[PDB]
Amino acid sequence: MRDLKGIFSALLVSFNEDGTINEKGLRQIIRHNIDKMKVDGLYVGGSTGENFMLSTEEKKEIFRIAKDEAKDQIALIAQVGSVNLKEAVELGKYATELGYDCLSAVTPFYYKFSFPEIKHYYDTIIAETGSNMIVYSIPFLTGVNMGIEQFGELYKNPKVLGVKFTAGDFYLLERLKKAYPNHLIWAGFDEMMLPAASLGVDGAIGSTFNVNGVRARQIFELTKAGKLKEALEIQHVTNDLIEGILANGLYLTIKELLKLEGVDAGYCREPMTSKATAEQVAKAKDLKAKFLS
Amino acid sequence: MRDLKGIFSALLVSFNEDGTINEKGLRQIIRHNIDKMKVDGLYVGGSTGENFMLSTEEKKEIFRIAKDEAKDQIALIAQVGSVNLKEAVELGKYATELGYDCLSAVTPFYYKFSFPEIKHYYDTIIAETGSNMIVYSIPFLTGVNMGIEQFGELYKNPKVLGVKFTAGDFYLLERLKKAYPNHLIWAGFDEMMLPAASLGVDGAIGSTFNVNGVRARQIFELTKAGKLKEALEIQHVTNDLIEGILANGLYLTIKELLKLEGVDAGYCREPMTSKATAEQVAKAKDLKAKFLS
Amino acid sequence: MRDLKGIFSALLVSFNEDGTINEKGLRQIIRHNIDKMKVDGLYVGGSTGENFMLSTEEKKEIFRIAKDEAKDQIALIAQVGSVNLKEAVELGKYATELGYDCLSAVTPFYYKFSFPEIKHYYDTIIAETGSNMIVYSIPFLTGVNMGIEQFGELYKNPKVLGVKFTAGDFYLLERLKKAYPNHLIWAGFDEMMLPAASLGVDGAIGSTFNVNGVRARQIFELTKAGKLKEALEIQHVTNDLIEGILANGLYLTIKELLKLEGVDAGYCREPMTSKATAEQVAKAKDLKAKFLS
Amino acid sequence: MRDLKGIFSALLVSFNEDGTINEKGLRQIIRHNIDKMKVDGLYVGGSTGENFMLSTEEKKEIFRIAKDEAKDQIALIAQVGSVNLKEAVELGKYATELGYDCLSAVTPFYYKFSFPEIKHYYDTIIAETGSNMIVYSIPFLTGVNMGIEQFGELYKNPKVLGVKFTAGDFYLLERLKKAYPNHLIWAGFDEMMLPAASLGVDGAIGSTFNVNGVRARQIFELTKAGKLKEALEIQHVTNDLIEGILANGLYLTIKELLKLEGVDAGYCREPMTSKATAEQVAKAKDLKAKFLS
Ligand SMILES: CC(=O)N[C@H](CCC(=O)C(=O)O)[C@@H](O)[C@H](O)[C@H](O)CO
Ligand SMILES: CC(=O)N[C@H](CCC(=O)C(=O)O)[C@@H](O)[C@H](O)[C@H](O)CO
Ligand SMILES: CC(=O)N[C@H](CCC(=O)C(=O)O)[C@@H](O)[C@H](O)[C@H](O)CO
Ligand SMILES: CC(=O)N[C@H](CCC(=O)C(=O)O)[C@@H](O)[C@H](O)[C@H](O)CO
Ligand SMILES: [Cl-]
Ligand SMILES: [Cl-]
C-alpha cells in the first residue's frame, strides 16, 4: 500500500441544478486539487462530498469518476460508511475493485450503537472487502481511558490503519499517539491544523484544502520543522478565511470560490440549500479578493 | 382522510439470520398488533422498524407487506424521511400509491440543516407526493418562542397535520397545543404517556405497543377521562416493563417477547446486534412472566 | 410534623439600590404571598431569593425577617445549601433555631462532586442540625436506574423527606414515585405544573407563585381532582404569563409585577442587572393588564 | 508591571482534619513551589485551592499566608471571583492591599448571567480596587465570532490584561491571539500544554505544577523554541502522570505526592472527600516511584 501520510482534500462534488452529478465539473474539481492544490491525496465520498444525501448508485459514480480522473497520480481513500452495513460492504467492495488505496468509514449513525457493534461494523467491512480501514473518532466517550481502550480494541484488527480524528480533544490525541505509535492519525479540523501537527499527526483530511491547499501544506511542513511563529502566521490567515467560509455556508462558499478560479463546482445537493444567494456569492467574491488572490 | 388519532404501534420488522426481511414473520407481527394489541394503526418504516439500516428496495418491500396484510383494517402512516431527499420523495410516492393514509418524515440528519432547509424538505415531499405529512420534533431549539415560530412556519403548509413529539419538553408541548389547536400531536415516549395525555395529545406512536398495547390504551383512555390515580398505577407497571426492556436492549427484547407469544419476530438487522444473547433471552422470559402473563 | 404539601412560593427578596436588603419591602413580599397569594408556605433562601449572591450574614437576616413576618401562619422551608458545607451547617442550625419547619439544600456545586460526597453533605447537615431535609435533583445522571439507586441511598436517612424536582425528566419523576411512594416530591417548574400533578407530585415550589398563586393553586387542585379540561385552560393562561415573564427577565419582571400591586419588591442584586429598563417596565405593565387585572 | 508570563502553580491549600486551614502546611506547599518547582509565580484562591468551599475570612487568611510566605520572590495573582460581587470586591480590595500583582475572577456562576452582567462584574471589581484583571473563558458560547466579540468588549477596559483559558477549543484560542495579539493568554489545561504553547500562549496556570513544575517548564520552553520532538517526549511522560492523578482523585493525589516529599499538604476540605483511602495512597506512591523519583 501506497503512502497515506500528508495533505488530503475531502473531495467536493459538482451537482447540476436538478441534483444530478455534473461529471465534467467533478473532474475539474479533481484536477484543481491535484494540479494546483498539490495535495498528497483525495478523500472521496466523505461528508464534504455531500455523500450521505446520495443514492448508492450516485456514490459509485463518484468513486468511478474520481479514480478515472486521478489515476495513480495521488493516493485515494474511499469513505464507504453508512447506517446500512450491507451498503457499506457493497461500496467498500466497489471501491476496492476500482483500486482505491484504502477505505474509511464513519461510525454508524442515526441509532446509538454500542462499542461492540461499532467494532463489528468495521471488522465486517474489512473482512468482506479485504481492504485496510481508517476509522473515525469514537462518539460519546466519557473518558480518555475508555477512548484509548476502545481504540485498542479496534486496533486488534491489523488492517485498521488509524483514525480520522475530529474530536476537539488534544489530550486524547496525545494519548492515542503515545499508546499506538505505529497507527496513523489524520487531523479532521483545518482550523486546528497547527496544534494537531505539534502533537505529531501524520496528515490532515480537510474540506478547505480544495481552495487553501498551498497554505495548508505550509502550516503542516513548518510545524513539523518547529517553525511555529511562521506556521501560526499562516494559520491566522487561513483561519480568517475559514471563519468567513463557515459564516457564509461551508460547502457553498468553497464551491463559489472554486467557480472564481474557473472550476465548474456547481450547486449543492438538496436537502442542503442548492443555490448560493446573491449575498453568499458576494461574500465569496470578498473572501477570494482578501485571501486567495 | 381516515382518523389518525389514537394508539399507533411503531412496527417492528422480522429479519432472517442473514439480514433479509422475513415476510412471514413480519405478517405475524402485523397480525399481533391488529388482532391482539388492538391498535388504532401502524406507523411503518420508523426508527423502530430498523428502517435506516435498510436499502430503498427493502423499505418498499416492508411498505408493501404492511399494506397488504393490514388492508383497510386500521390506519397506516408511512415514515419516508431520509438524508437523501430524492429517496424520501421516491418512498413517499410509493407509499402514497400503495394507499397509506399519511406520510411522516424524520428531520434530515447526519448534517446540520438550517430551519429553511428543513421546511423545504417537508414542503418538497408534500408537493411531489400530494400526501399529508406528520413532522418530527425540530432539533436544536434554543427556546420555546423559536420552537413555536418554527412550527408556525411548517404550519403554513395546510398539508402538515401535526407532529410526532419526541422532545422531553412538556412546556413546549403545552405551548404547541395552545398555539395550534387544530394540529395533532402524537406522543413519542411510551414511558411518558400519562403526562402527555394530561396535556391533550391526540395519540401516541410507540415501540412498546407491539407487546403492551392493552395497558397503553388503558393509560390513554383513563387519562383523558381524568382517572389519574388508576392511569398512574398502569403507567407504573408499564414503566417497570419498559425499564427492563431498555436495560436489556430495546428492539431485541420486544422481539424476544413477541417470540414468547408465538410471533416469529426474528433477528435484528446489522449493524445492530442481530442475535439476542442467552442473557438477553433470559431477561425477556422474566419480563414476560412478571408483566405479560 | 407541620404539613409541607401544597403550594410554596420561592420567596423573592427586596433589595435597595445599593444591594442591601430592604426589610420593609421584604415584609411586604411575605405579606402579599400569605394574604393575597394564599400560599401554603414559603421556600426561603432559594435561587429565587437571589441567595447565592449574598453573604452568610445577609442570608441569616432574610431567614430572621421571613420567620418574624410569617410567624406561624404558614409552613416555612429554609434552603441552606452551599458549596461551603460549614456555611450550610451554620445556616441549617440558625434556621432550625428560628423554628423553620424543614431544611432543604442544593447539591454542592462549582466543583464536580461524587455521589458519596453529595450523600455525606446531606447527612452532615442533618446530623449537625437535627432537622429534616428536602434534597435537590441529582445532577449529571446517565440513567434512571442509577438516579433511582442514588435517591434510594439518600432516602436511607429517615430525615430526608423527599425532593424539590427540577430535572426535565418525567420518566425519572414517575420512577421516583414508583420506587419511593411515601417520599415527597415538589415540582420545581411552574409551566409544567399540570403534567407534574398528573404524576402525583405532593406540591410545588415556584417563583411565579409570588404573583400567580391563585391560578397555581387552581391548576394543582383541579388536576388532583381529575378536572383536566379546566386545569389545562388555567395552565394555558398561566403559561402565556410565564412566557412573557421569561422573555422580559424573570426576576425583574416578577418584582415589577409586585410593585404594580403596591409591594416594594425593590431592585435585583448585582451581578444580576439591578434595575429594569423602560422597555422591561412597559412589558411588565402589559403582562399585569392582560393576566393579573 | 511585575511580569506575569510563564509557569504559575494554582496553589493547593493544606487543611486540618476538621477542615480548618493548616498554616504551617500551607507555607510548606508555597516553599515547595518556589524553591523546588521553580515556578514563576502562584495563582492563589483558584479552583485548585478549594476556594469555593471556604468562607470569606478563610479566603483572606490564605491570601495573607501566601503573601507573607512568598514575599516578593515570585509573581502572585489573586483569584477573587464569586457569585457574590460584594464579596469579590472585598477580596479584590484585600488582595490589592496585600500587594498581589494582579487580580483574576471566575465568571459569576450558579445563575445564568448575560454578557453585559459579566462585563459589569469585571468592570466593578476593577473600578473598586484599581487593580488589573485576568478574566476567565466566557461560558455557554454558541460561536467563535461572538466569543471573540465578547472578549473585545471585556478588553475595552484597559485594565483587563487577558484570560485564563480553560475552554477545550483551540480554534477559539487561535482566534483570540489573532484578534488581540497584545493581550495575554494563560493555558489552564496541563495535559494540553504543548499544543497551547504552539499557538502562542504566554504562560500556564495549573494544579499539577505543584508537583510536576520542572517538566511543565521544560515543555513550555522547549515548545517555544520549536523543539517539538523533545517537548512531546516530556509531555508524554507528564500525561502518564496526569492520567494516573486524574484516575486516582486529583486533589487528594497531588496532596499525597506532596506528603511523600515531606510537605504537609494535609487533608481536603469537605464536601470533597477529606481523606485518601488506602488504595489511593498506594496508587499515589506508585505514581511517585514512576514519575517523581
Ligand atoms: C465536520 C467537517 O467539516 N470536517 C472536515 C473534515 C473532512 C472529512 O473528513 C470529511 O469530509 O469526511 C473539516 O475539513 C471541516 O470542514 C473544516 O475544518 C471547517 O470546519
Ligand atoms: C426513540 C424511540 O425509541 N422512540 C419511540 C417512538 C416510536 C417512533 O416514532 C419510531 O419508531 O419512529 C418510543 O416508542 C420508544 O421506543 C419508547 O418510548 C421506549 O423509550
Ligand atoms: C430555575 C428556576 O428558576 N426554578 C424555579 C423553582 C424555584 C425554586 O425552587 C428556588 O428558587 O430554589 C421555577 O419556579 C422557575 O422560576 C419557573 O418555573 C419559571 O421558569
Ligand atoms: C479544572 C481544573 O482543575 N483546571 C486546572 C487549572 C487550575 C486553575 O486555573 C485554578 O485552580 O483556578 C488544571 O490545572 C487541571 O487541574 C489539570 O489540567 C488536570 O486536568
Ligand atoms: Cl501501534
Ligand atoms: Cl391550528
Side-chain angles (χ1 to χ4, degrees), chain C residues 1 76 97 110 238 279 290:
Chain C
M1 74 198 201
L76 296 170
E97 290 156 7
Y110 186 87
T238 287
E279 307 96 279
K290 289 174 175 145

Side-chain angles (χ1 to χ4, degrees), chain D residues 249-263:
Chain D
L250 181 63
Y251 291 79
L252 284 171
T253 302
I254 299 170
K255 293 186 182 195
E256 178 60 26
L257 292 169
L258 291 171
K259 183 176 179 195
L260 296 167
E261 310 205 15
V263 171

Side-chain angles (χ1 to χ4, degrees), chain A residues 179-183:
Chain A
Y180 310 107
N182 306 295
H183 284 78

Side-chain angles (χ1 to χ4, degrees), chain A residues 145 168 170-171 174-175 178 191-192 194-195 198-199 223 226 228 232 235-236 239-240 243, chain D residues 145 168 170-171 174-175 178 191-192 194-195 198-199 223 226 228 232 235-236 239-240 243:
Chain A
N145 275 288
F170 287 106
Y171 173 39
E174 177 276 331
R175 295 279 80 196
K178 184 179 182 286
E191 55 269 50
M192 293 192 299
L194 178 44
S198 86
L199 287 172
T223 303
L228 304 181
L232 180 62
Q235 186 78 69
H236 283 329
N239 287 8
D240 281 352
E243 186 181 345
Chain D
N145 171 240
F170 282 45
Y171 174 37
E174 176 280 331
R175 297 277 82 195
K178 163 60 175 29
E191 53 271 43
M192 296 196 298
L194 192 164
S198 83
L199 287 172
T223 302
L228 296 177
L232 182 62
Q235 184 79 70
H236 281 326
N239 285 7
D240 276 0
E243 188 177 357

Side-chain angles (χ1 to χ4, degrees), chain D residues 55-289:
Chain D
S55 71
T56 303
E57 284 300 314
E58 286 171 317
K59 298 171 182 179
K60 288 175 56 179
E61 182 173 346
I62 288 158
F63 286 132
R64 168 188 67 72
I65 295 163
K67 178 59 180 175
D68 183 68
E69 187 59 41
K71 298 198 200 316
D72 55 17
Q73 189 164 9
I74 51 160
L76 296 170
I77 294 163
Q79 195 292 134
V80 300
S82 176
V83 181
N84 182 349
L85 174 61
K86 295 197 182 211
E87 183 190 24
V89 164
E90 177 180 354
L91 292 171
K93 288 181 176 293
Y94 186 69
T96 298
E97 290 156 7
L98 281 187
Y100 275 80
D101 297 304
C102 197
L103 301 183
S104 182
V106 63
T107 320
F109 54 95
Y110 186 87
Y111 299 100
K112 309 292 185 184
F113 294 91
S114 68
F115 177 76
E117 291 166 345
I118 293 165
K119 170 170 170 56
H120 173 87
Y121 164 95
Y122 283 119
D123 288 342
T124 297
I125 297 162
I126 293 169
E128 295 300 316
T129 61
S131 284
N132 291 328
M133 177 61 53
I134 294 165
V135 300
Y136 271 60
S137 292
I138 297 162
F140 321 117
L141 294 169
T142 56
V144 182
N145 171 240
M146 178 194 61
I148 293 303
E149 185 167 37
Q150 293 182 354
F151 279 102
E153 283 299 310
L154 296 178
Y155 295 171
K156 285 181 160 180
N157 190 326
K159 298 179 63 64
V160 175
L161 306 185
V163 58
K164 178 189 92 184
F165 200 102
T166 53
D169 185 355
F170 282 45
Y171 174 37
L172 177 63
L173 185 54
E174 176 280 331
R175 297 277 82 195
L176 246 199
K177 266 305 172 177
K178 163 60 175 29
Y180 315 105
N182 293 305
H183 283 75
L184 302 168
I185 303 174
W186 291 262
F189 19 61
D190 310 4
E191 53 271 43
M192 296 196 298
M193 178 182 259
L194 192 164
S198 83
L199 287 172
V201 299
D202 304 279
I205 293 158
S207 64
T208 71
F209 310 160
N210 283 276
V211 292
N212 197 45
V214 174
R215 289 193 185 90
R217 178 176 293 284
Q218 295 167 337
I219 294 162
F220 192 69
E221 295 182 353
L222 287 166
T223 302
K224 297 305 278 265
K227 298 185 168 181
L228 296 177
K229 184 163 181 141
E230 295 175 57
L232 182 62
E233 189 56 19
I234 299 167
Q235 184 79 70
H236 281 326
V237 176
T238 287
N239 285 7
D240 276 0
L241 170 63
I242 295 177
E243 188 177 357
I245 289 171
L246 289 175
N248 197 231
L250 181 63
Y251 291 79
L252 284 171
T253 302
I254 299 170
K255 293 186 182 195
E256 178 60 26
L257 292 169
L258 291 171
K259 183 176 179 195
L260 296 167
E261 310 205 15
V263 171
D264 186 9
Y267 295 78
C268 277
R269 170 71 169 237
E270 295 190 351
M272 284 179 70
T273 302
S274 72
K275 179 178 181 164
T277 59
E279 307 96 279
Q280 284 174 301
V281 170
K283 182 137 178 284
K285 288 170 178 174
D286 288 348
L287 296 167
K288 169 157 193 69

